[PDB]
Structure formats: structure tokens, C-alpha cells
Amino acid sequence: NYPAEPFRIKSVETVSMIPRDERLKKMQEAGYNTFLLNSKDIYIDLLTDSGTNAMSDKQWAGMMMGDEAYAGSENFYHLERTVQELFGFKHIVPTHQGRGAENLLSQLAIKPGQYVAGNMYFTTTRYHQEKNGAVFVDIVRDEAHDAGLNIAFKGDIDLKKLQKLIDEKGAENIAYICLAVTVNLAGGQPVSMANMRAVRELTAAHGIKVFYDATRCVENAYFIKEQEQGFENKSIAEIVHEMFSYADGCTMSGKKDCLVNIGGFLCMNDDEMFSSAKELVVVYEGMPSYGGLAGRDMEAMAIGLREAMQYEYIEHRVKQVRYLGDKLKAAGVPIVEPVGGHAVFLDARRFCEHLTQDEFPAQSLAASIYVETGVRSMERGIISAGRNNVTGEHHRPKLETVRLTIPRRVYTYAHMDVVADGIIKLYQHKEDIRGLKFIYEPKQLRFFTARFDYI
Amino acid sequence: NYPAEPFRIKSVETVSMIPRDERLKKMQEAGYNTFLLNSKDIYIDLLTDSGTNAMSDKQWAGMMMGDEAYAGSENFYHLERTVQELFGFKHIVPTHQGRGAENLLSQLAIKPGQYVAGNMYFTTTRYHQEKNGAVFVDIVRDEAHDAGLNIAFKGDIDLKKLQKLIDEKGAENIAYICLAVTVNLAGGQPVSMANMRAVRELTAAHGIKVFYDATRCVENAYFIKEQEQGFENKSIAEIVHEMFSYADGCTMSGKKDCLVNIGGFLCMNDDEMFSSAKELVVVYEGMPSYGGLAGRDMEAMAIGLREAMQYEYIEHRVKQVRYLGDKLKAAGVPIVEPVGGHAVFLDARRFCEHLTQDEFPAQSLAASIYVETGVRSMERGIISAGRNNVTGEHHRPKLETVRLTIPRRVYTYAHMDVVADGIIKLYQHKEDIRGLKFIYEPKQLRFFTARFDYI
Amino acid sequence: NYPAEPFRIKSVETVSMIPRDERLKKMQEAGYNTFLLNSKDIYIDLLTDSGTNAMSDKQWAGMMMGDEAYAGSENFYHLERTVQELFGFKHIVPTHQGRGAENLLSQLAIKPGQYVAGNMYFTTTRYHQEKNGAVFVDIVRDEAHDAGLNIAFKGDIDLKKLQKLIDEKGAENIAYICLAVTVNLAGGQPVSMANMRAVRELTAAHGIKVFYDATRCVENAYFIKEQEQGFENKSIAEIVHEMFSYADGCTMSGKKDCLVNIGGFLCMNDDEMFSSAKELVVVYEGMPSYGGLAGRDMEAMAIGLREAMQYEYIEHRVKQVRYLGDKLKAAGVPIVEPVGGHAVFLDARRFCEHLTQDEFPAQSLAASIYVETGVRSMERGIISAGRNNVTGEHHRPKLETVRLTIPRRVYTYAHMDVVADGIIKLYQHKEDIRGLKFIYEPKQLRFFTARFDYI
Amino acid sequence: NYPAEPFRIKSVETVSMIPRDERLKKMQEAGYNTFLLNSKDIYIDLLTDSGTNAMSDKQWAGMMMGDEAYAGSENFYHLERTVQELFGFKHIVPTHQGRGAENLLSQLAIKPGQYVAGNMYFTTTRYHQEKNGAVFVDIVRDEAHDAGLNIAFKGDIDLKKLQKLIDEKGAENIAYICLAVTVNLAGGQPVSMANMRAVRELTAAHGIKVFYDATRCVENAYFIKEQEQGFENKSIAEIVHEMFSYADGCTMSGKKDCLVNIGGFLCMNDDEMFSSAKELVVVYEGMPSYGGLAGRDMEAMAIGLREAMQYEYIEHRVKQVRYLGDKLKAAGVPIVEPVGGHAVFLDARRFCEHLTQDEFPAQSLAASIYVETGVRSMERGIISAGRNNVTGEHHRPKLETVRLTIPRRVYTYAHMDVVADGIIKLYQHKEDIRGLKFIYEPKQLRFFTARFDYI
């Protein structure tokens, strides 16, 4: 049911291993805000699955072969090639990370007042659309928004909302379709291949462009392989290449499924767009030949993209998350379902039924997980949603979650046990989890630096 | 006169060593544009001094100590504390490179229609200023536009122009003063400490903010020590700290004087502006704790900044460039003078008086240098100025130069000899340099991919 | 019971993951000798615990700081000072590995015809002793030769035998006492602190020198802490230091408990012997300042020794082996007991009672394990004992075992499960294990290259 | 005349750069013995050309791909292959360094009382022959012993002394011919290919075996290419492979021409010898599959051996030494001639004509070179030759030299200038160099730790 690691450990990253009593002082010193803890004081850092991947020995042999020419670097050539071969986009511009590609895609493909429609959104992506004049429309299935509904391919687009958007608004005024795989906001839910093929035939008919937010495309490809009829004899690399055939381009963040600690890229097939991309790339990132990346990082991303296609790697990655989700669900701990490709989201509202959302249950639960286990998790509730500065009132988000985001090839099943066991013991005396009040609240970006105290 | 390397070679980058006949083929495949040459086919790459520095064995040991947490990394802490110590600014936000810092500073510091005044500009910096509504005003002394005039501290601001701008336009309508150390357009020329003090006193009086474009600020420090009376007992580290004491903040590309291959940072002292910066940095670069850089890169840049302060390193850096210029001057080759900190600029109109500027003398020279020595240099003339799209006619630039830009710690004095020697023998037969016609010209960013043939 | 890894995965070694049918081909190409298998074709290599440790990110940062001077290296100084501190010996001469230390100690400490007495032997150590004229005398307690007897501190010396040797042969005719921690032939069994004190007092009385074979001395430390009354408040670092206080010097293979891939060292307190050692080390290993090791390796071994002292590391190391043994014991698989610090030994005569020891049961089992799981283990039986060349007949060894040796910090608990699970299902059909005949047998070192077929 | 480096610097090793006054305290603290100085306090360490080579970026990418299996490692396979392909020996056993191979060759190929004859000797090699019963006979040309005679191929064997040795002693009692390339003792002098072909036909006729001491075989191959008629159209790899065709095997030290910091090997074509080598390899070095080397070191040696065949690399290496020799000879500084492949030997007896050999001129000159330049050199005179412990009298060596041994790819021509210039300034006031007296003299290995004072 749960595979052993399809790799050996080559090098370890040592941890201090501080006791509960010292962890509580550390948590207090951070103001009960896990964003303020130091990296050194944390055993298992599940804050994000972004850029904290463990690289292979081959990736580190790439790291010493960094040809750092400004232009003409063999690292750029090898990255271009790999992405062309694997994803099949004609052109490819390297960027420092996913949000660097996003910035470029939104400046090049949006006319003010056009609509951008996708399957739910991701913060940096919506920002760049919106800052360029687009109106974002969510055309995800309604079922994606029910956080307990256990259905498959929950990130698919409603073709029926897709159609009415074109009828009602006009294909002309639709900038592009932003299809994301997986759907982060629904908890890392996969998009079926049928869904992607349907979306491309509808949009093609009406002349509409489709651009993929492909940050976790390889976790998506595993779901298709695991769960869609017809892909049982297909390889992950075949599924990934078919996926990108229903798209005109994509913004990718290597920090997610590329198994690197930095790097992203923009791909497109349009030669015209590509020439415009090239001029805009030099102001924001660096020349078209390196895009704000050191050569050794283009190489390591190249080797990573290829390493991610190994079935055994992506199966264990995804099933290592599911392991954690299964163990929590088995004990009755409330989570978002079905468990996604990269994280387990605890539902803090249900976990902490005694607390109201003003007493910051997700934030407080996330503080407690650190003290009990030495595991850092991230608040994804009311604190992260911010205050409405018109009214002054918090924005009250429907989802009041603590996210357990798993970096790739860093932790073992024993580390998941540590996590699961602490959360289970906490669930068993859930009523004893206190509420938090701010003792310090920033104007902007409050989740980052807010500090709190117990009520 | 000319110091020996104050280091030893730890590891080499192997090179091909292809012969003249093979290089001529390579330059032909490239369409005689040196920007299209492959990095593998080049022996000594002087395209740029950006990001191609050789790191130390301690930087590389820091490379293996990357703490890649999203937040709380030991490498962000070591970076932050190193800049605060060395440069003296209160806050520091890391960015993937210099232009990411510039984007951020210009969104935070300019109201549309205000004036931003500096000592000559750099492309990216001027773009970010103007893109945010600023009108750019060049207040460098008149003597820095004279490419042949050999005076010291050619980068200094004319205070007389700085006064008239305040008079004429008013200090409320001045966004900030953009002081660059050193000045790249004038050939990498230094700014005196007196000049920096003078500017801080005049702008202070009028409430005007002063932000440095500090990318080559340690090369500048060296000229201050070598040439300004009074700084003969001060250390490079004291010179740097004093310099930044006259600025409100700075944008910095670590790729230039921090001796790394990627990385930059915005600094400022204003708390209010720092908070605005943190919300904006998330969208463009990454969380404010990493700013688009892997942990290992924050580490290496921290260790780099600190190595850059060693007298003997910087003294050998600047004197190695000087050596190349000295050898060229002594054979009668025309160069920008006086020699800067980072590059030698050949004067290609002089070098090639038989050719008109429509016959693309600098590009042709840069093609000929590669063919004869295996060295790549950058065209900096009519080809890189671009055409006027309303007229259609070339922007015919006053300076028609070939830039020999020297990466820190990569080449030896024998390498300077290969360059010098080839450039001297071409000078001896300068009349045999043919002109070039376009055989393919791109709508935008023409210098990057234009290809040519001989007339 | 079973601790989680007290570290995180920094970098992985990618593995093939070939299927059963392909492994069977591979095992056949190997002639069913697991020593001929390729390292690429192996998933989990338990051939040996020697030199295949995963290093830390600090060891690797030390790897980039190799000062490779012939003499005066900072890495020799950091090594020397770390051993002096941790182990407490006055002098320390680095050697390329444990047996280089042994060669040196035996040339310096034995007069031909003297007796050298220890607690069971190890091949290399016994070779170097005997090659220098020594007669080897086993003074381990009688209970350690009983492979099934589960007592603690099975490595302890019988003082009664140590007394008779002194009586019978005289202390002048005793070269030195060779005390091994832990005892590899008995299955990696520990030596109590009491036993080490007892020996030091008896040998001291008689003027007899005591040199440790300390290769797994930190695994031993752990058993002392876990099991000897009185050492419950002492640290691994205090246990180690106290242990070496009962020895005159030690030969050490860093490949085993210093967590490195190469390196060893001889220690002693005698100045006279140190001077003789320095002249002899030059001929066999290198100058006394490097002893056959690159500077980077002296560095990593210094950093390794110091990491080996962390309670949680060593406690997880020893408990990971125990875990594997526990799972095997619980299904009724016969193993040497009690489980050692570094390996589990299967009892293959038991496991395979249908086969005679001429039918090569251990080798056959080791072939079958690889086929069924992808794990390599070592034959330790009749095949590795060799033949008698006067008789021609096999040396028929009392112990007929398959050793599952676990490298430090490389595999997880899921990896232990793969092994355990395969070994348990073979045990369930133990009668189907065929015997092997030689199809090629070498004159010497037969186990290394012998090949077989099935009967 | 002197080529530029055929490489770029990838990483630097920082140096402290301490002034003459502090260097003199450092020299005093070392007892005027350069063997006692620390590596950190030295600018340019010319103590030895052994193991202090700078590796390439490809070699360091090998360093991260170390497959550390005990047996079956892909690194072992790649080393075996490279050596088989390049040198052409049938079998090859890895050893920790050159003296590990020597130890094995001498145990396997000498019967007590047999003669070993070679072209002069090297310490560790003669030791291992002599310790195994051989009588060494020097059959080098007489001209090699005249240290000022500038002739080519000074390391050739006298075929006429070769013949009389067989006549007078009997081919039967000649163990093997030890042919070394280059000849270290004559100052790194080359052996012609004709000489090697002649030696093989003579020895073959009488059934006598020939084993190469090939530590600097690649510097030898350059001389043949530079100076022997007929090899102008041959490549270095062709010259090296022909060289080894006149040999039955060889001991190699990778630390010399293999461009690594550790590693050696033994090669032979005899299958019988090879089986005996295998059993003896496990006691002294480690299994036949790794020979006392970590996997990453076998890989790096593999890539190094191949990198050394680049003509441009070996030409610049050798001509970088010659540069130093030419500059010293031009000023009249007395050296051994002709300058060898790896070092310049100063003749301290002539340099210091005012001092008698009891006042230790070479030692004192070597102390002065450090104080004036920060360059460490090695005494190779009376101090290194030792005392005769029968008489108690120093052994008075004919050659009283200070050796300037150049590591490969570490220093530039500017570093050689630093060296040359300091030695020239010292020569100009040569009479002011004082004599030394011991204040501390070790029984064994005196050169290593003797300390002195000025008379």
C-alpha cells in the first residue's frame, strides 16, 4: 500500500532535536506564529513544499558544472532541450521562479478589462492577472469547494460554466484560460486528462488561449495514471507530454515538481509572444539565456525535471502524503478530502469547535503542533486572509486550515508518524487548545510577522 | 605596478582551445554576432563582468550548507547581518539580482511625473524609473561624457546641475537622487567620497532621498583609497561603510562585486518603506526571507561580500583590468579613458576610421577579436542602441565601443596578454577590418540575435 | 521503541528499481555470488557497514575546505585535535583506513614469538599480528562462541583466561592485549566498561600493553549507556573518553563509526613508539601529517567523529538494526543473538536444514535474498572460510551465516521492511532453497570471485 | 614561448598574505624548518608537486557521484576502463597512493637476494625493494649524475650497464627492471622512447621483467613529444600508450600526473601475479574493488587521467616550470639542469659558497625564501640525508639542493615571478645568508621536525 523510498539517502541535514520545554520557549519567542520560528529550531519543516526539495547526487554533479556565461551557456541549452522534449512547448524562457513567469505571461496576454478564467486561483497568479487589468472568473466544478466531498478529479473545470462565460461575455474579451494542475486551493486536487482535452476543444473552437499553471504537473500526472481509465499503460512522461499538448504555454515553478530549490520558466508556442517575452524578460529577470538563474541552477532544474518522471519517485511522493492523510483520517482527525498531491490540510474549525474564528483556531493549532512535535505547519485561515481595510474587519475565510506541506524526498514515513501521532494526541484532548489574541498586527502581510498571546 | 593573484587556483574550468579556422566557422555560424557564440566555443569570455565570478572554497563550503526553509533560514540571517554590518542599512530585502531590487525601489519611491536624477543611467535602472512615471535627469559632470578626457572621479555629480533641478522643478517634485558607484556608461568610473558627501548635504537640506546603485561599490571603494587624499589609512571596509552613510538605501547586484553568480538586494533605512517593500517583494521575487534566492545563494553572497573587502583582492581586481588597458594604451590602441574598474572599452570608430557607423564597426571588431584570439567581447554601439520605430532609422550613438568586461577572479595576466596581443595585431592592420550588413534584424532587442555578413 | 531519524534527507542516491525477473538474470550473471553483483543493480546494499555511510551537510562543507598541503594542513590539525579531545590519546597518526593502522601497530609492538591476546579476532588485525611473529590467543568469554545464547556484553574478555596466559606464558612474552569494541565475530557484541577496567588493572599489574581495535567504539558506547548500570547519566562522549582511558592506544577505522567513506588512525600515548611510527608511516601510508588521506578526508572524519557523539544519532543507528532483528525474531527466523550494533546475522544452517554445509546454504540464501528483494548481503560461512591446501578440503566453519550489514544513515525503516519482508517470506518456503555447486573456484580469496550453479 | 593557461579558474583558495615581518616570526616559530610551517601561513606552497593538484569542474562533478559500494562500484569500473584503455595494462588494482602499489609489487616480484636495477631510485620504491630482499643497482647513464650537464633524455638507462649486469649477475637473479619516468633524483629528467624500446628488447631476450615507476609519465610523454624525432605527429595519449607497451606493469601515483589529491594503482598483465596481488591487496589497502580509496576518488582519478592527456594542459604545466627555471638561469642563479618536468632544484652549495655543508646551506636558503616571498620550498640536502647512526656523522650528499616543486594547475606565471624575483634578490646578496645549527634533532626522520638557529 505504501512504497519504500525509491532511493538511498546520500547526505543528511542535521537537526538539533530540542525538547518540548525548549520548543515552547521557542514558540513563545516567535509570538505563537510559526512563520517567525527559525529553521534551525525545527525538526520537520512542513511550512511549504516549495524549494525545500532534496536534490539527487546527479543534480549535485550538475551543480559543479555550472557554465556561467551570460549567453550561450550549456546549462541553458540542456534546460531548453529537456523542457522541449518533455513538455513539448516550442519556446522556453527561464525565470527565477514561478512568479517571475507569471508576471511575464500576464503582461503579454491580457488587455485591460479582459476576463481570465481558471479552476480556482493561486495568490501570485491572480495578482499578476488582476494587476494587468483582467477580471478573474472561477470556473472550477462546484464540488471542489465542498472540502469534505471525497470525489476524484476535483480540480476539473465546469465546461458548462466555461460555455456560459463565452456566451455571456464573448470569446473576444476572454484573455486566456488559466488551467492549474494540481488545484492548490482545493487541497492539491488533480485535473483529469478528459477535462483538459474538453477545455482545449471548447477554447480552440472560440479562438481562446489556454495557459497552464503547471507547478505540480507531475503530481497531477500521477493521479491520471493512478485513477483515470485508459492511462494504465502510459508512462508519467507520456502523461505529462499529452497534458501539455492541450495548452498554448505555461508558467512553471521548478521549486515545486522540478525537485530544485529555485528556478521556474515560461513556455509558449507563439513565436510572436516569444519575441515580446524576450524584451520583457531582460527588465524583470535577466537575459533570455539565463532568466535570473545561475547556470548550475538551469542544469539542476534540467536533471530534476527528468528525475521527476520516474514512476517510482512520483508514486512514493504522492503516497507518502496519503500515508499521512490516511493515518489522520483513521483516528477521526478532520482534514480536507480527498488528500491532495502535496499537503494534508487539517480543518481547524472542526478540530477546534470550542473556538470561534476570531480566536484564531488554525494559528493556535499550528502553534501547538510545533510545541508537541517540533513540526512547523502553516496557518491558512483567518490570519492569512487579512483584514478588510475599508471596514477594518477580518476577512472570514470559509476554510480555516493548518497546512501540512511536504517537501519532496526530504522526510521518511517515521517523520510522518511523528507528525501524525502528535496531531492525534492533540485531537484526543482537542478541547484544551486555547484561543489566540494579537499582541502585534502588521498593516500589510500580517501572517508573516504577527505575534500573539493566549486568551 | 601589477600585483600577483592574492589567491591560489582551487579548481579549474576546462576549455576547448579550438584553432583560428574553427573559430572563424563558429563566428560565421553566429552570424558574426558575438552574443550568439556558444560558451563552450569560447576561451576567454569578456562579454560581461556579471555573475561569472569564480567563488572561493569558503563560498563553496557555504553552498553545501544551504538551509532552504521558506522562512527562518540561517543563510538569510547571515546575509542580513553581513550587509547591516558592512553597508550599515537598517533593513535588507534580498532579491534574485540587481534589477529585482530596482523594480521594487521604483514602485515604492516614485510618484508618476516626479523627476529622478542621477549620474548617467544603466538600462534596467532607467527602465524601472520611467516605467513608474519618472522623468530621468542626467546630472553627471560634463567631463564624463568626454570619452577621451583623462580626469579622476569622472563619475561625480555636478552639484551645479543638482541645484538647478531643485530650483527649476522643486524638491517636492524630485523622487530621489540615483547615485551610481561606479559609473558604467562612462567606462566604470569612480565617484569621490567628497562628491557623495556634497550630494547628501544638498539633498538633505531639501528633504530629497538618495539611493545608490551600488553594484560595483567595492571597485569604487578601491579608487577612493588609491586616489582621494585622506583615505590612505582607511580600509576598504571603512570606505564602503562611509560611502553608504550618505545614502538612504541602495539597490545592489551581488553578481558584480559580491563575487557570486546570482543574487542582489535592496537596502533602506525607512521602516515605512520596508513594510511596503515586504508586501511587494512577495509578488515579484518571493517571501521577504529569501527574495527569489535559494538559501545556499544567500550564504555564498554573504561570504562573498565579506571576501570582497580584502585589500589585496580588490587591488588585484582593479589592477588586472588596468594592466590590460595599459598594454593597449602603450601600443596606440584607442580606449575609453581613464580605464574603469571592470572593463576596458575600445574606441572602435577610431580603431576603424575607414568604416562608417552604418557599417557596424564595433560589432565587426568584436567579431574579429574572437576570430583572432578566442575571446568574446560585447558590442556597445549602434547595434545595441536599436532603431527608431517611428523613423525606422538607427539610433546613432555617440560612443561606438567594444567592451572587454573582466569577471572577478577567473583569468590571469597571461589571459590579459592573449587579449592584448590579439587586439594589438588587429590594430596594426586595422584597415583590413571589413564592415557588416544585417542579414537578419529583429523587431526588438536586436543586439541579442541579429546576424550579419560582410560588405 | 523505534526512534525516527534524528536528521533530514539532504541529498539522495537514485536507484534503478529493477524487477525480480531482471534481478534473477543479474544474480545469474554473477554466478549467484552476491560479491560479483554490480552496485548499480542493487537497491539496498547490506554487503558491509564499512565506508558507505551517508555524510552530513557539514562534512560535505568540510569536503570543499580541503587544505591539501603535504604538511601543515588545517585539516590534519582539526583531526588531531578532535581525536585528542574525544578519545584522549597523546599522539595520533592518520592512516588511509583501519588496516593501515594495524600494519603499523603490529610492526611496532610485537617481537616475533610473543603472544597477542584478544576477544575474538578480525581478519586484518590477526593477519598483521601473525605476519609479525605473534601467536594469537582468543580470550573472549566462552559464551560469545555460543551464537544462540542471549546474554548482554557477550564481547567481554574472560579474565580467568587472561590470568592463565600470564601464568603459563609470562607477561614478558605477551606483546599486548587486543581489545575489540564491539566484537564483530560474535555478531557485533558490546564490551562492558567494567570489563575494560578489569583488563586495564590486570594488564597494568603485569606491565602488559592494551591496544583497542576501536572501529565500532561508538556503537559500543551506546550499549554501555543503554545497558550498564551507572552510565545512565553519562554522555556518549563521556563513555567514549572513559573507555579509551583503559587503553594504551587504538587502531581505528573511520569508515565504520566516524561516518566517512575512507580514513582511519592509529593512536598511542607512548612518545618512543610515536617516533618509530612516524618513520614507518612514511613508507606504507604517507607523511605523518596526512597518512594516506587527502586533506578533505581528514576534515570530514574529524567532523564525522564529533557527529557520532550525538545521542539521538547513535541511538537511532543501533535501534534501526534492532528493529530489523526484532521483526526477524518475531517471525521465527533464526539469527545470531543478541542482535549487534551494526548487522543482523541470519543462521543459515537453521534457515536451511534440508541442505548440508557442502551445499553452500549461506551463499544460496544470500543469492535468494537479492533475487526476492533487491538487497545484497554477505556470505559468512564455508565459502568465505576457504579450503585447506594441504588436505584440499573446505575449512568447515561453525557459524554458517548470512550478514545483513547496515551502513550508518543511508536507509530508512521502510528499507528495513523490504529486507525483513523478503527474508520472512523465504523462511515460509525455506525448503525450496536449492543448494549450490562451484562452477568456478579460485586458488585464493575464493568468496570474492567464486561462481556457482544450482544442484 | 610560454603558453597562457589552457583553462579558466573555477574556484579560488584564499590566502592570508602576511607580511615579511610576520613571516619571519612564523619561520622562527617553525625553527627555521619549512616542514614545520603551517599551510595557512604560506602564500605559494612549492614543498611538493604531490597531491596538491587543482581538480577540474568535471572532476568535482565526479566527486558527487561516488558510488561507495565495497564491491561493484561504478567508480571502480570507470577507473579500470580508463587505465586499461589509456595505459593498456590487462589488470589493474587500485591503491591509496603510489607507495601502496610499490609495497605490493615488491612482495610479489622479488626473491631475496635478487637484484632490482633501475634508472636511479626514489625513496619509497627502493625501500620496498630492499625490505623484500633485493639488491638495488643504479643503471642510469653516467651523465644523469652530473647536475650541470645540459643534455636531453638524461634519465635513460645505460644499455651497456644493463648488459654487464645480466652477464656478471645472471638474468635468473635479476628480479625486475624498475624503469622510472621521469627520473626524480636527476631533477625530473625524461626517458626517451628509444631508451624504453631498447630496454624492453634486451630484457625480453633474457626473460627479464620490467616495471615502470610511472608517477610522472605524462610529463615524460611531453618531453618525448617535444624533443624526440618522430613523435611530432603523435598525441600525448599515443605516446603514453606506446610507453606502457614496453613494460610488464607499473606502480602509479595519481597524486602526481593523475591530477588528484590521492590515489594510486598497480597495473600488470600477468594473470598469475594479479591473483597473488588480489590476496595481498586486502591486508594492506582494502578489497581489489576499491583498494583503500573512496569511490569518488576512483572516479576523480579516472577523469584526471583523461584530463592529463590534453596536449595544451601538459605543455603549459611543463613550460610553466621551465619559465621559472629560465628566469633563474638568466640571472645566474645556479640550478640543476636541464630543468625537469615538475620542479626547479636550486644548487644551494653554489648559491651559498661561503657556507660549508655542516652549516646547512639548503635548509638555510629554504628558510630565507619563505621569509622573503612567502613561498615554501623543501630542503633536499644534508638535513634530509640524515646521520649515519654507526659513526654518528651526517651523510654528506653530493646534491645540496632546495627543491621548488610545482603542483599542477594551482599557480600562475605571476606566482612564479614572485618566487623567481625573491630568489634573484637573495642571490644578489647571497653572502648575507647565514648558516644554521641544530637546536633540536630527532633520531628518525630528522628533516620533518628538526628545529634550528642561526650561527
Ligand SMILES: O=C(O)CCc1ccc(O)cc1
Ligand atoms: O508555500 C507556498 O504556498 C508557496 C509560496 C507562497 C507562500 C505564501 C503566499 O502568500 C504565497 C505563496
Ligand SMILES: O=C(O)CCc1ccc(O)cc1
Ligand atoms: O614531495 C615528494 O617528494 C613526494 C613525497 C615524499 C616526500 C618526502 C620523502 O622522504 C619521500 C616522499
Ligand SMILES: [Cs+]
Ligand atoms: Cs529554497
Ligand SMILES: [Cs+]
Ligand atoms: Cs551567472
Ligand SMILES: [Cs+]
Ligand atoms: Cs567507501
Ligand SMILES: [Cs+]
Ligand atoms: Cs593531498
